[PDB]
Ligand binder design. Structure first.
Ligand code: NAI
Ligand code: NAI
Ligand code: MG
Lengths: 298, 298
């Protein structure tokens, strides 16, 4: 069967290019796709594309993902995180195609301790969350063969990521400051991509799995504890670090235009039992990307 | 369920560490595994390990893979490519576990033009092939819940590979010589790993899929044409190359201790229809590993 992937160059998209390749005949698009429209600024054009190809499955990894900039341009975000999602949803539903789509925990507020469930009420704390909410609701109302994967703290080894930015700091600096009161599970693009591939093959066989899912690596940590592991990992690999002092700091002390939740924890029991898949502890995925970065035959 | 992977540090193994992680609880071993035996020099010890854990699925990516050295030490190869495969097979069969195992086209002779099929007769041209034959036959006779994936020209982006070795040459040299009369499909460790993960999930549900499979990327090329693509890819990415002259050369003109087949072509229709998976053209996988190597955020 035919699979159409939008957002092929993103973190998750680049991993989907790999994961979806054996599952069906993959057509991978992004914004610059010359010979096919992959620019979510043209909701009608991504519809046309979806009519032009007729896919059995659409995997959407494109989005407006700069949360802070979104506050300054809620319009463009709306277009990318909702308008084009509806346009692709309705078109998907013209042909009975499945639509796979990623969302975010920014759809919930904040209240430490408890992991959010799919049955929990939503009240988006910032713009990103809002437009993405509009996006999943739109998918929900226009295209019943869907899989929405709500995720959080996504990283990949290709391209910039938290680990790397922190490592640049740790090379160039002696003391460093990082949030220790935001809680979640760093989730690999590898894990996302692979789970998607399997979930597609179930859904084709069991249409009842359609719906909304929480999808993250297991466990929970904070940015400061995440950074500590990265530091330690790098010390263990022989990366010399200028860094001598690592201090934990509250969220508030340093500005971000759009608010971040203190509680990005997500319960993923729904996904685990509906797909019979395992979601490994967050550390595995991070240590693996760190090794790949450190043992770079080159 | 529990998955046990031997050969976790190899090309295919490193990709299996990722691909198998959502499929079940993964225990990943290699030779140096301190707290568990993963050294195929101790066939009884890998048996013990397999009894110590009781897996539902065993994925074996460990092997003696230095074909030329094998001619000088057919004994050690036998141990790694057959003896330990039988020991793990018989133990697998004590508990009804599935055994997944990789083999090679070196199991066939040579006769250009036609792709080898699973129903074709085998006559191994070198030691590697022989011990690996002993390995699959042993698996075949001792453990009926098996999946043998015969593959060829395997590469990964981590660690040394043909692309890289060639690129080192192309940086340091002006003229280069490479075989143009050996035919096959370079097959990515990514493709291998992902197909394995899916094939496991079918086999658990449809035990009749058990058996021997040809598994390679589609198409066919030669080392010289493969190297040309790598050169071109790198020229397209801005890698400056000293290389000015690229000459095709026959196999014979330059020595290898163990013989290489002129015909590594493999027909993979069996795998495609039994698993309902797609096997993409070899170029995709190579261009992707090249991009990852070239766009190395670092
Ligand atoms: N990155 C994160 O922390 C998280 C991401 N997610 C979701 O996961 C999904 C993937 O995220 P990433 O891979 O991190 O995103 P990314 O930022 O790496 O990738 C963004 C993708 O959107 C594409 N894009 C940008 N503008 C576009 C336009 N005008 N038209 C079409 N495509 C355009 C980019 O080209 C790229 O392929 C998105 O749904 C995202 O909202 C969810 C939770 C957190
Ligand atoms: N590499 C290739 O061109 C091809 C490989 N294959 C098969 O694919 C499989 C994987 O190949 P690669 O990932 O390329 O292999 P590799 O050479 O990258 O990995 C070899 C693996 O065997 C392990 N190993 C070596 N000695 C061991 C010992 N004494 N005990 C336990 N493990 C030991 C290594 O530690 C490593 O994990 C093997 O079955 C191989 O024969 C098949 C066709 C071609
Ligand atoms: Mg990778």
């Amino acid at each position: 069967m035919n699979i159409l992937l939008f957002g092929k160059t993103g973190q998750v998209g680049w991993e989907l290019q790999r994961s979806l390749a054996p599952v069906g005949n993959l057509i991978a698009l992004d914004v610059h796709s010359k010979e096919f429209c992959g620019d979510f600024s043209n909701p009608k054009g991504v519809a046309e594309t979806v009519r032009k190809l007729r896919p059995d499955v659409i995997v959407n990894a494109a989005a407006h993902t700069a949360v802070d900039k979104a506050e300054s341009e809620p319009e463009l975000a709306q277009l990318l995180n909702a308008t084009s999602v509806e346009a692709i949803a309705k078109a998907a539903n013209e042909t009975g195609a499945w639509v796979v789509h990623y969302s975010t925990d920014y759809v919930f507020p904040g209240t430490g301790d408890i992991p959010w469930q799919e049955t929990d009420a939503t009240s988006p704390l910032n713009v990103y969350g809002k437009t993405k909410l509009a996006g999943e609701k739109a998918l929900q109302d226009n295209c019943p063969k869907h899989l929405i994967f709500r995720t959080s703290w996504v990283y990949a080894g290709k391209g910039n990521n938290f680990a790397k930015t922190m490592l640049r700091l740790a090379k160039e600096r002696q003391t460093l400051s990082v949030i220790n009161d935001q809680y979640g599970a760093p989730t690999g693009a590898e894990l996302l991509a692979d789970c998607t591939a399997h979930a597609i093959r179930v859904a084709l066989n069991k249409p009842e799995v359609a719906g909304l899912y929480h999808l993250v690596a297991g466990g929970t940590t904070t940015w400061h504890d995440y950074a500590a592991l990265v530091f330690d990992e790098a010390r263990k690999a022989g990366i010399t670090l200028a860094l001598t002092e690592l201090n934990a700091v509250p969220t508030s002390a340093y500005p971000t235009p759009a608010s971040r939740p203190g509680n990005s924890r997500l319960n993923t029991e729904k996904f685990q039992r509906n797909f019979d898949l395992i979601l490994p502890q967050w550390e595995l995925g991070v240590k693996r990307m760190l090794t790949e970065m450190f043992t770079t035959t080159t």
